[PDB]
Design a protein around this ligand. Structure first.
Ligand SMILES: [Mn+2]
Ligand SMILES: [Mn+2]
Lengths: 735, 735
């Protein structure tokens, strides 16, 4: 009977320092041990580079440990939001660890000696989205809990009005992209395959030497034509200019770490083609990679002599005169859409733009309409339908609209999420085949060109079965109809359709509305329903799982940070994500400088409830059920009494809201009558907490408004942090 | 990017000489290379007997090459009607080749030495239905093209009227045949079995050493009783006589090379019982085998002294006075039903009889009502339902009736089509068991007699799956319902029924009308529907596929020569049979003697349209689909314009009709509007052919009416033959 709580980075971790003690006190009453696990960026640096560390300094491979635990039918993991480290974040975490006596190697951006290549490659394991692929050995059940939905209706968030005369739209490719050249197939038997490029010269380049494929795996051979991509950009940049609408670009270079920077990069290239021509030679040897955005260019020209660097920036701002207006990320500082690929992230930016009435920010500071460019059509057409719907129906009404929960196929690096190590920028014109080693059979041929992006996504049979099961499970349990978003004109989704059609019959689907529709149809059908106050489950692939679980919750609730993210693992256990957003760097900024943490721990409370409830069902622990339901009613009272953390310094913060939760949790257990022992167990505690309420609250608020010492950033001192995060001694002694 | 076009025998080959140049000129305009494959009777003898040939004389095994090519997903084979060599045909081919300096052995019918036995067996690989078993690695989709049916409505073919007092009927067995003694089962595991006869003496004769069987395969143990068959024969011959109705016998001796001649043989023997008893000893040692018809007896008595020969034939003619009139193949030359087993072929003779109003020819040369004897009741009683139907409803009206396409299970030597090498005339009374060699398990027991025909036909699981999938596909694409003609009382058809019941669930059958009925019922249901202009798909086994795709097309169209015969190959490719009939040797005799080939190449145009149709789907070729649709209208225009070959010499022939088709095809591409490049590409060629119409046709017609030289028959000279098949000056120069 063990719950694994994850120690992560920044704000969620700080909240954990105050919350971990109070969850431990409640969980022990059911015989559950709350065991910690450190997956912070620092702990992952240490675990990898234990080469020059003492025994006491060494840490286990906590990620690999948790990854292994997912195979255990009793796994119970609570995953808090964590950093997906960029280079600057990695460097800062390294530098802090070094200064604290941990002998870890520097990260060499450009490895001089060959020994530096090995440790740079070892750091590549730490960079980016590294935690999610390992923990996701199940499929996604993401939905807004009834109590949160009810709260959104009573307290509606602001939403920009949609004008019928709005000019904003999604711009996307009609040919030469992944979708319009896709070939797909379901595997007959186990095979081992290689990815080879037979050039026009006659040479055979092996891009990927070997990949093990199981029976029933779906594989795709999709590519994007570089020539088409640029001609598309030429066209759209021109169109946006001619029509006078603001140009914007929405990709996900954060997670799609290979393909999307190439997509991002090309936009910048063709947009500023006049400047990139004047300085081509200079840019080349400077090693400028604008795939990393303009920020890369600006870095590599900053060291240059003043008269030369100023000439460069002048050729860039001069290029704007024949160009369309650009969407800005920070219009005061002059930071635009093209500055960094990690600024405008498709899953978050598109909802934000729709939420605002189809608006993004201009160079003048004004909001205006935008051509929201999403080059890859596969998953972007669905956004356009909503824009169209809104244009005729107006902005959604949070007080009356329905819900769109999601059942997402993600398990075992599903589809595009596990295709990173299998994506390649093509070196020269040739034919790209995936060939079987045993029997030289080309499984899928594809004619590619120089620059083209080629990848082979993989989705295993077993995950698909669980995914369909979860769809029917959610349908039965909620009474909501469910729609599978599967295109008829996309090979990959016709392959999935064959499977869904079959595996549905393996389940009892007698009293359920379950159908299959292509993306755009499904979106329309879903929109036609939400607007009439009706609910619909979206059973979707991996990338759509990501998009829709940001999109709809932003519209329904105002945020994607207030919802359940349950991962039923295929081996029997459950993983429970508390948040889908970042670890809130700015929240830590406010905590260290003026002792106020505005992090909302609601997602943690909800996940813990879903953790404790599933503990009751799987093991038979009836005392877990009672704690879960009491936390369920404790969380609900937290919302209705309006005691979520304030953003203003000096008011009720994260620590303060943790008190009120634990109070209500204690009260809920004291005044219930389905377990006699637990009732009288919490009775004195509940009586205690309530009695010195405006004494504990008085302490937690008085200590605010000053600089505080946690002893670091990426590795804060457990002793100092705990003092700060538990500053109420009245509260602490009560347990 | 290739289409394999088969070079065959006789008339289709001659047509191909005129056609291959013009199909290549069109197919290169889409990036498709057309390569030939010689599978003629000559090429198949040379391929087998390369021992005595020089290196330059040696030809590749093209038939085996094509057999391997079916396993390739890119396969695209246009198969044309070839010769299924009879002995006299094989002899003539051997002589022709030997005469051309090809050292090939004589075929030894009665091998003296043991070295002669060797090469007779090597020739037995060439004899009979040799191509089809190897090429048919998929199931049959045989149907009338929409453009052909519509021509038959506007121009009906002559049909003989059905009197309600018509005496004609199918006579067939009620016990003792394969049907009423049949045992059948599905295999659970992989095993290897043997065919053994446990005799009365205690001895066990091994009839078949070893045969590998897969899991999920349907196997049958069927036997026809010698005593029951001759009792049947003696009853029906007596019946036909008593009633005064003309006797006729319908079998498939050509393909059923083992069982049917024994069946044919017993008919003749009991019919001529008086002669065969008087001359028993003489006929014994003369070696006369009536399994090969009366012609065999006529050969083996021709050399005998005039007095004795005239005694034998008078005893045969004397036997005719107490027997019924026999049906005549050619009454002028005195050739009857009994002359040769390969003269009256069931699948064509029965439709010919029914189309004629239930009439066949007699001694005087007039049409007469007949007793159409089909000894085996498994697939014959299906004919009797149509006869009855016609007796009450009169003849079919082709101007109003519906279509009956066929989806035929045939893949991988399925059912009775693969039973030849496993069919045995029983040597002595005993039990006939099929036994697993590993373990001693007796799978199917049966009790047989001296002279019985025992066989074990097999059909594999994967072919069945493709068959069912093809039915659903055809239903979905056309809209018309499909009926599985499967009996309840035939064990083989219940094993099939079980699989058809299961494998229909693995498919989307939503808006589709799919049902299983017994043969007799299904026929009646089909007939009741078509008579009021409604369409029905017949999903049937192997023999029924053959029978029905001659029967209805004969009635709907007047001929089974003009129709699509597509074979979706299981590996993903496609085979397109241009004709189910023969190679028409009489057409060749007319061409050599008078320079006029009356061969109809319409089946070749349709199979090419279908070949280009599938080409675009699998690979992605856009220009290929344009060619298919332009051909589909060019073929139609040819029918409408009435420019098909005449049969009278000195008029429009195969060469002429090929011109108009290429003219209509270029013109069809001259005015299309979806590939602007192809429109202007064929624009000069279409204008040239339309400008030279009366010049080209003047040439092709003036060369007729003369004896011409093609340098042989079974192996024609490519130079001389191309000189004959392309005699047009201005037509050729415009390519
Ligand atoms: Mn997201
Ligand atoms: Mn036939």
């Amino acid at each position: 009977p063990t719950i694994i709580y994850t120690l992560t980075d920044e704000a969620p971790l700080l909240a954990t320092y105050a919350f971990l003690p109070v969850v431990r006190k409640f969980a022990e009453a059911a015989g559950i041990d709350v065991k910690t696990s450190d997956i912070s960026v620092a702990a992952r640096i240490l675990a990898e580079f234990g080469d020059h560390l003492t025994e006491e300094q060494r840490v286990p491979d906590n990620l690999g440990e948790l990854g292994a635990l997912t195979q255990d039918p009793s796994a119970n993991i609570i995953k808090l939001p964590n950093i997906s480290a960029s280079v600057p974040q990695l460097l800062a975490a390294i530098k802090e660890l070094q200064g604290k006596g941990y002998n870890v190697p520097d990260y060499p951006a450009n490895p001089k000696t060959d020994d530096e290549k090995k440790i740079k490659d070892r750091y590549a394991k730490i960079l980016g989205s590294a935690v999610n692929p390992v923990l996701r050995e199940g499929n996604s059940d993401r939905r807004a809990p009834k109590a949160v939905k009810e709260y959104a209706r009573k307290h509606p968030h602001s939403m920009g009005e949609w004008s019928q005369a709005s000019r904003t739209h999604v711009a996307t490719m009609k040919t030469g992209d992944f979708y319009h050249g896709e070939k797909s197939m379901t595997l007959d038997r186990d095979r081992r395959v290689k990815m080879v490029l037979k050039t026009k010269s006659g040479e055979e380049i092996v891009l990927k030497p070997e990949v093990k494929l199981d029976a029933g795996d779906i594989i795709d051979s999709m590519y994007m034509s570089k020539k088409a991509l640029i001609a598309f950009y030429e066209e759209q940049i021109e169109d946006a200019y001619k029509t006078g609408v603001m140009f914007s670009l929405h990709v996900k270079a954060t997670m799609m770490k290979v393909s999307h920077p190439i997509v991002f990069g090309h936009a910048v290239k063709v947009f500023y083609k006049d400047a990139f021509a004047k300085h081509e030679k200079l840019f080349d040897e400077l090693g400028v990679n604008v795939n990393n955005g303009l920020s890369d260019l600006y870095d590599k020209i900053e060291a240059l002599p003043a008269s030369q660097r100023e000439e460069i920036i002048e050729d860039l701002h001069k290029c704007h005169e024949h160009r369309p207006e650009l969407a800005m990320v920070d219009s005061a500082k002059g930071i635009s859409n093209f500055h960094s690929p990690s600024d405008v992230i498709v899953d978050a930016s598109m909802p934000a733009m729709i939420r605002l009435g189809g608006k993004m920010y201009g160079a003048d500071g004004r909001t205006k309409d935008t051509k929201a460019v999403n080059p890859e059509s596969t998953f972007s057409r669905m956004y356009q339908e909503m824009i169209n719907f809104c244009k005729t129906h107006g902005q959604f009404d949070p007080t009356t609209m329905g819900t769109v929960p999601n059942v997402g196929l993600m398990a075992q690096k599903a589809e595009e999420y596990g295709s990173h190590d299998k994506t390649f920028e093509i070196p020269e014109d040739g034919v790209a085949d995936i060939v079987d080693i045993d029997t030289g059979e080309v499984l899928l041929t594809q004619n590619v060109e120089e620059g083209d992006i080629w990848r082979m996504p993989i989705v295993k049979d077993a995950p698909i079965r669980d995914w369909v099961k979860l769809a029917v499970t959610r349908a039965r349990l909620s009474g909501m109809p469910v729609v599978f978003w599967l295109d008829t004109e996309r090979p990959h989704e016709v392959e999935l359709r064959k499977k869904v059609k079959e595996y549905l019959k393996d389940h009892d689907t007698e009293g359920l509305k379950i159908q299959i529709m292509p993306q755009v149809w499904a979106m329309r059908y879903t929109l036609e329903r939400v607007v009439r106050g009706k609910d619909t489950i979206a059973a979707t692939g991996n990338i759509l799982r990501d998009y829709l679980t940001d999109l709809f919750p932003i519209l329904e609730l105002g945020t994607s940070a207030k919802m359940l993210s349950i991962v039923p693992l295929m081996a029997g256990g459950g993983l429970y994500e508390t948040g889908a957003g970042g670890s809130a760097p700015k929240h830590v900024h406010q905590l260290v400088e003026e002792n106020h943490l505005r992090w909302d721990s609601l997602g943690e409370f909800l996940a813990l409830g879903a953790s404790l409830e599933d503990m009751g069902n799987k093991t038979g622990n009836e005392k877990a059920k009672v704690l879960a339901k009491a936390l369920d009613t404790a969380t609900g009272k937290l919302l209705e009494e309006n005691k979520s953390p304030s953003r203003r310094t000096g008011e009720l913060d994260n620590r303060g809201s943790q008190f009120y939760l634990s109070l209500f949790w204690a009260q809920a257990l004291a005044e219930q009558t389905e377990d006699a022992e637990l009732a009288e167990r919490f009775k004195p505690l509940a009586k205690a907490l309530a009695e010195q309420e405006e004494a504990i609250v008085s302490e937690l608020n008085s200590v605010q408004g000053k600089t505080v010492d946690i002893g670091g950033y990426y590795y804060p001192d457990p002793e100092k942090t705990s003092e700060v995060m538990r500053p109420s001694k009245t509260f602490n002694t009560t347990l």
